[PDB]
Design a binder for these strands. Structure first.
Ligand SMILES: [Cl-]
Ligand SMILES: [Cl-]
Ligand SMILES: [Cl-]
Ligand SMILES: [Cl-]
Ligand SMILES: [K+]
Ligand SMILES: [Mg+2]
Ligand SMILES: [Mg+2]
Ligand SMILES: [Mg+2]
Ligand SMILES: [Mg+2]
Ligand SMILES: [Mg+2]
Ligand SMILES: [Mg+2]
Ligand SMILES: [Mg+2]
Ligand SMILES: [Mg+2]
Ligand SMILES: [Mg+2]
Ligand SMILES: [Mg+2]
Ligand SMILES: [Mg+2]
Ligand SMILES: [Mg+2]
Ligand SMILES: [Mg+2]
Ligand SMILES: [Mg+2]
Ligand code: NA
Ligand code: NA
Ligand code: NA
Ligand code: NA
Ligand code: NA
Ligand code: NA
Ligand code: NA
Ligand code: NA
Ligand SMILES: [Sr+2]
Ligand SMILES: [Sr+2]
Ligand SMILES: [Sr+2]
Ligand SMILES: [Sr+2]
Ligand SMILES: [Sr+2]
Ligand SMILES: [Sr+2]
Ligand SMILES: [Sr+2]
Ligand SMILES: [Sr+2]
Ligand SMILES: [Sr+2]
Ligand SMILES: [Sr+2]
Ligand SMILES: [Sr+2]
Ligand SMILES: [Sr+2]
Ligand SMILES: [Sr+2]
Ligand SMILES: [Sr+2]
Ligand SMILES: [Sr+2]
Lengths: 194, 56, 237, 92
RNA sequence: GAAACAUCUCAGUAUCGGGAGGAACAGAAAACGCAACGUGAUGUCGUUAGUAACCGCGAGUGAACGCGAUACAGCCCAAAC
RNA sequence: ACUCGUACGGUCACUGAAUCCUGCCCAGUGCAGGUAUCUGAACACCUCGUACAAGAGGACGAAGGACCUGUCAACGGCGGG
RNA sequence: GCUUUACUGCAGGCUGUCGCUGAGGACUCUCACUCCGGGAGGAGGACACCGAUAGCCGGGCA
């Protein structure tokens, strides 16, 4: 039979319809008065969180992060530039808002490591994402056969190096064949052409 | 008044002093920032890639 | 070219800033809950460096010593009242609803409880005209009919220091001293006397503007100089 | 100059002389779906667009003849080399 | 550089911000598409090839599949119950 | 920032104490207001096209422009016969 | 370096449109949102702000 989780999933397929439409209209009023990074005891989307790797265990932290909507907040050139490089308005950043949210969360929690993240909506001027972070030093996580991989030294600052899920997708590593000639194994090895 | 020799006579102000962090006489005692190692500005030591030739 | 003087202003550097550390008080109306039972005695009459007009020192019933925007005629010993049931005497502050029509008023609020925005300069006054349950029409010193909320507070009388504009500065030094107390760069060099690099009107073998002086509203900072969006120019016609 | 609307001449399709009808080549409408149209959309971005920033040139004082020679029997047309003419009016 | 120059080129180079390791990154197909009765995670080396592709179709720019090698290793969740 | 400021304010310009004065021109350019009608992009909408899409056309029409008016202590002009 | 009705563009301003954005070719409301108020509460209000796009102006700048 269907899990209770499947109903949280089905509700979030259309966040502008049903009971969720009313819920988000209410919640966002409280969220807009909240900070940049807010630690929350329980995830707003349980199904998505558990699907991404969350466990109701010690050393597993969740945090909601708000990042602004739109393109790059770029300064106009202060010296000689050819027409192609004279733009300000139409320039967008190469990292998506989700990735920015994950980094801001990881900074607030210097000891923890980013496991994953998901969208929890947006209004007219900002986007909210909930980031699942893990304590690599807590023995509750060091003994977990499903999460102890994140404890390894090479997993230190994994978000800042693009090793996160949203990182790998934004780096164009999804496809294993056609189109990923300049993305795999890294953007930098391929001369930054990805 | 000339900008050369007669304007040099007013130079008795102490700015750059021996730094607590690096030991160079680059700690600006008015700005409280070191021009050599970046003490007072950053925790990380001041270093730049232009301090050497590009392929070195 | 180089950024014009009006662009250097916005950066808010020392030269363009007001000597705030030399200013006395931010003359706002007192905060009452209701009941009106707040009155005070005028202790001193001081000079206000910010507006070149006098200001009155008042000591209230609840032990609060605050400087108030002095209307004409207010002296030491006089009792001033602030609130709804306040007496309709010069120097008292009450909402526009309680003040009778045809009475000269000053230090008028824009939104109720803001402390006063309009009619504050030397010798000026706002004129309360029409009453309603929704709107209080006040005629501001510029001649504009401002429709306001009757709950907006105001002080009865004209502002003190009237006729300041009547006497000439005579010499540059007198202007210098006044300007040193304000947030303005003085003296004024004409754009037409500058180089092309410094101003839109700069350059040339003789002094004259390079294009017409009437600039569009849509003009960007660096170009918006001369006669800003003028509906007309000149005296005649 | 004057030009006859209908006249006898060679038809490369029929391989024999037939009565042709002369018509001025009307400009066919553009679809906006050719490669050049897709390249205009692709290659145009911030600043100058190279070739796509150029505005169409002038005119020659007199244009050449742009005509279609339509066959009276088989109904097929053929093109010929044009000649400089300031005006071209048809007779009948 | 294009014998000017704007797209293009120099070049995702210089330089800047953030961060890991002894190596990094990648990695067990929603792949390939010598179309197959075929291959079988990923790097990398040789080649494929200055080929396909791009380009004021100018100057220039420029892969991949495959193949020969090197080394080889495959697994854990979420959910169902 | 102006601003502990509020039109007797302060911003943007021109002229340059006082005294006597400061003529005529709004066609062009600038600014501003108006505007029946004309022109005026995209989204949505309608027609055609396409099992869809590209695309073609239509309807509506903002600011702006046309047009009209105001304005020279606004740029300026004040001749030939 | 500087100028402009040189070429080409880039900021900026104005304006339409989409999102935020809700209830009953002009209108009412309040619940988002904005501002004022210490607070109670008041003003405004699906506009404005902001994000996106389109047209116009645009030597302010390259
Ligand atoms: Cl991390
Ligand atoms: Cl003054
Ligand atoms: Cl012809
Ligand atoms: Cl194969
Ligand atoms: K270049
Ligand atoms: Mg590599
Ligand atoms: Mg005040
Ligand atoms: Mg000063
Ligand atoms: Mg002057
Ligand atoms: Mg000079
Ligand atoms: Mg200039
Ligand atoms: Mg002169
Ligand atoms: Mg002059
Ligand atoms: Mg060259
Ligand atoms: Mg050439
Ligand atoms: Mg290249
Ligand atoms: Mg391939
Ligand atoms: Mg506020
Ligand atoms: Mg220039
Ligand atoms: Na961290
Ligand atoms: Na690419
Ligand atoms: Na492209
Ligand atoms: Na050359
Ligand atoms: Na040159
Ligand atoms: Na090109
Ligand atoms: Na005129
Ligand atoms: Na020079
Ligand atoms: Sr670290
Ligand atoms: Sr001397
Ligand atoms: Sr000295
Ligand atoms: Sr510092
Ligand atoms: Sr460095
Ligand atoms: Sr105030
Ligand atoms: Sr206040
Ligand atoms: Sr000039
Ligand atoms: Sr006149
Ligand atoms: Sr492109
Ligand atoms: Sr372009
Ligand atoms: Sr010609
Ligand atoms: Sr293998
Ligand atoms: Sr005079
Ligand atoms: Sr005119």
């Amino acid at each position: 039979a269907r899990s209770a989780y499947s109903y949280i999933r089905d509700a979030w397929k259309n966040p502008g319809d049903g009971q969720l439409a009313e819920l988000q209209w209410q919640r966002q009023q409280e969220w807009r008065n909240e900070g940049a990074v807010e630690r929350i005891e329980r995830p707003t989307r349980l199904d998505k969180a558990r699907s991404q790797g969350y466990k109701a265990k010690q050393g597993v932290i969740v945090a909601r992060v708000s990042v602004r909507k739109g393109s790059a907040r770029k300064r106009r050139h202060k010296a000689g530039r050819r027409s192609k490089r004279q733009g300000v308005t139409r320039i967008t950043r190469r990292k998506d808002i989700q990735r920015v949210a994950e980094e801001r969360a990881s900074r607030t929690f210097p000891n923890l490591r980013v496991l994953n993240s998901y969208s929890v909506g947006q209004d007219g001027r900002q986007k909210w994402h909930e980031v699942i972070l893990i304590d690599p030093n807590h023995p509750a996580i060091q003994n977990d056969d499903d999460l102890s991989w994140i404890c390894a030294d090479d997993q230190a600052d994994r978000v800042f190096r693009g090793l996160t899920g949203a990182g790998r997708r934004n780096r164009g590593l999804s496809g294993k064949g056609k189109g990923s000639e300049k993305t795999r194994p890294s953007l930098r090895s391929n001369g930054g052409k990805g | 008044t000339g900008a050369g020799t007669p304007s040099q006579g007013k130079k008795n102000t102490t700015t750059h002093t021996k730094c607590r962090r690096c030991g160079e006489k680059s700690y600006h005692t008015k700005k409280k920032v070191c021009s050599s190692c970046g003490f007072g500005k950053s925790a990380k030591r001041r270093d730049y890639e232009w301090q050497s030739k590009a392929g070195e | 070219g180089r950024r014009i003087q009006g662009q250097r202003r916005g950066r808010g550097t020392s030269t363009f800033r007001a000597p705030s550390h030399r200013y006395k008080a931010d003359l706002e109306h007192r905060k009452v809950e209701d009941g009106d039972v707040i009155a005070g005695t005028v202790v001193d009459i001081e000079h206000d460096p910010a507006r070149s007009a006098p200001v009155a020192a008042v000591e209230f019933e609840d032990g609060d010593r605050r400087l108030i925007l002095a209307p004409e005629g207010v002296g030491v010993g006089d009792e001033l009242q602030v609130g709804v049931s306040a007496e309709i005497a010069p120097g008292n502050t009450l909402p526009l609803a309680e003040i009778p029509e045809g009475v000269p008023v000053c230090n008028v609020e824009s939104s109720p409880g803001d402390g006063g925005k309009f009619a504050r300069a030397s010798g000026v006054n706002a004129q309360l005209l029409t009453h309603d349950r929704n709107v209080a029409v006040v005629k501001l010193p510029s001649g504009e009919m401002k429709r306001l909320d009757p709950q907006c507070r105001a002080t009865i009388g004209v502002v003190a220091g009237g006729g300041r504009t009547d006497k000439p500065f005579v010499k540059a030094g007198n202007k210098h001293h006044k300007m040193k107390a304000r947030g303005t760069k003085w003296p004024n060099v004409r754009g037409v006397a500058m180089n092309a690099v410094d101003h839109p009107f700069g350059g040339g073998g003789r002094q004259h503007p390079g294009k017409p002086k009437s600039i569009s509203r849509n003009a960007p900072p660096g170009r918006k100089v001369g006669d800003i969006a003028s509906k007309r120019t000149g005296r005649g016609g | 100059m004057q030009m006859p609307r209908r006249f006898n001449t060679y038809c490369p399709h029929c391989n024999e002389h037939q009565e042709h009808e002369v018509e001025k080549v009307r400009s066919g409408r553009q679809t906006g779906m050719k490669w050049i149209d897709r390249q205009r959309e692709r290659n145009s971005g911030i600043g100058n667009d190279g070739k796509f920033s150029k505005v169409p040139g002038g005119d020659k004082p007199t244009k050449k003849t742009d005509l279609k020679y339509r066959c009276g029997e088989c109904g097929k047309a053929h093109l010929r080399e044009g000649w400089r003419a300031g005006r071209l009016e048809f007779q009948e």
